[PDB]
Amino acid sequence: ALPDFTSDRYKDAYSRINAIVIEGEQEAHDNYIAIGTLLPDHVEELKRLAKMEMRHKKGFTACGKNLGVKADMDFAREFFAPLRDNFQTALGQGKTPTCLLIQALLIEAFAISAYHTYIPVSDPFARKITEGVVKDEYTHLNYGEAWLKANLESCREELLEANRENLPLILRMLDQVAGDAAVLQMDKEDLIEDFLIAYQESLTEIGFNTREITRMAAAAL
Numbered sequence: 156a157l158p159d160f161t162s163d164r165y166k167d168a169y170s171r172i173n174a175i176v177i178e179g180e181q182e183a184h185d186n187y188i189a190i191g192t193l194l195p196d197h198v199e200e201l202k203r204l205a206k207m208e209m210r211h212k213k214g215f216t217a218c219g220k221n222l223g224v225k226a227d228m229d230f231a232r233e234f235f236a237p238l239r240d241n242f243q244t245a246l247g248q249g250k251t252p253t254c255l256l257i258q259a260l261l262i263e264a265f266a267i268s269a270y271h272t273y274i275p276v277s278d279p280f281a282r283k284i285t286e287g288v289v290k291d292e293y294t295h296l297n298y299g300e301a302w303l304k305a306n307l308e309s310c311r312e313e314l315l316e317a318n319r320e321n322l323p324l325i326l327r328m329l330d331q332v333a334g335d336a337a338v339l340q341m342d343k344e345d346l347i348e349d350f351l352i353a354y355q356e357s358l359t360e361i362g363f364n365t366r367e368i369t370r371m372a373a374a375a376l
C-alpha cells in the first residue's frame with residue numbers, strides 16, 4: 156500500500172532520500188564536465204548530458220518542496236564522499252575508463268534501479284517528475300557504454316580494478332539507506348535485483364562474457 160506522504164515518519168526519511176538524489180544529480184553534472192577535460196572531443200555531448208542532470212536536480216528539489224521537506228544536504232555529501240573521492244583520484248591520474256565506470260555505469264544503474272523501485276510507491280507530483288526522468292535520461296548507447304565498448308581491449312584490466320574498488324561502495328551506500336527506503340515502501344531486494352540487471356546489461360553491451368560479469372558482480376561481497 157501507498158505510504159502516508161504527510162506523516163513525520165515519511166518526511167524524516169524523505170529528507171535524506173531526496174537530498175541523496177539531489178546531490179547525485181549535482182555530482183553527475185560535475186562528473187560529466189570533469190570527463191570533458193579527459194575527452195576534449197566529447198565536450199559538447201558531455202555539456203548536453205550535464206544540462207540534463209541539472210534539469211533533474213531542479214525536478215527532484217521540487218519533489219521535496221511539494222511535500223514540505225527540507226533536504227538533509229550534509230548527510231547526502233557524506234553519503235557520496237567515498238565514491239566522489241575515488242572519482243577525483245582517477246580524474247587526477249587521467250584514468251578515463253575508471254571515471255566512466257563510476258559515473259556512466261555504476262551511478263547510472265544505481266539511479267535507474269532507485270527510480271524504477273520508487274515510481275509505484277511515489278506521490279502523484281513526484282511520480283510525474285521521476286517518470287519524466289527515466290523516459291528522458293539518455294539515448295541508446297551512453298557516452299560511457301559506447302566509449303568502453305570501443306576502447307575495451309586497451310582498458311580491460313583497469314575496468315576489473317575499478318569494479319573491484321567501486322562496486323562494494325555502491326553496496327555499502329544501499330545498506331546505509333535501506334531503512335529510509337523501507338519507510339518510503341521500497342524493498343531492498345527489488346533495488347539490488349534491478350541494479351544488478353542494469354549493470355549486467357551494460358557490461359554485456361561493452362563486450363564482457365557471462366563468466367567475466369559473474370566474477371565482476373561477485374566483487375560486491
Ligand SMILES: CCOCCOCCOCCCCCCCCCCC=O
Pocket residue numbers: 175176179180183262263264265266268269325326329332336346347350351375
Ligand atoms: C549491489 C547493490 O547495490 C544496489 C543499489 O541499488 C540502488 C539503491 O539506490 C537507492 C538510493 C537512491 C539514490 C539514487 C541515486 C541518484 C543518483 C542520480 C545520479 C544520476 O546520474
Ligand SMILES: [Fe+3]
Pocket residue numbers: 180183207208211266
Ligand atoms: Fe540524472
Ligand SMILES: [Fe+3]
Pocket residue numbers: 183208263266292
Ligand atoms: Fe545520469
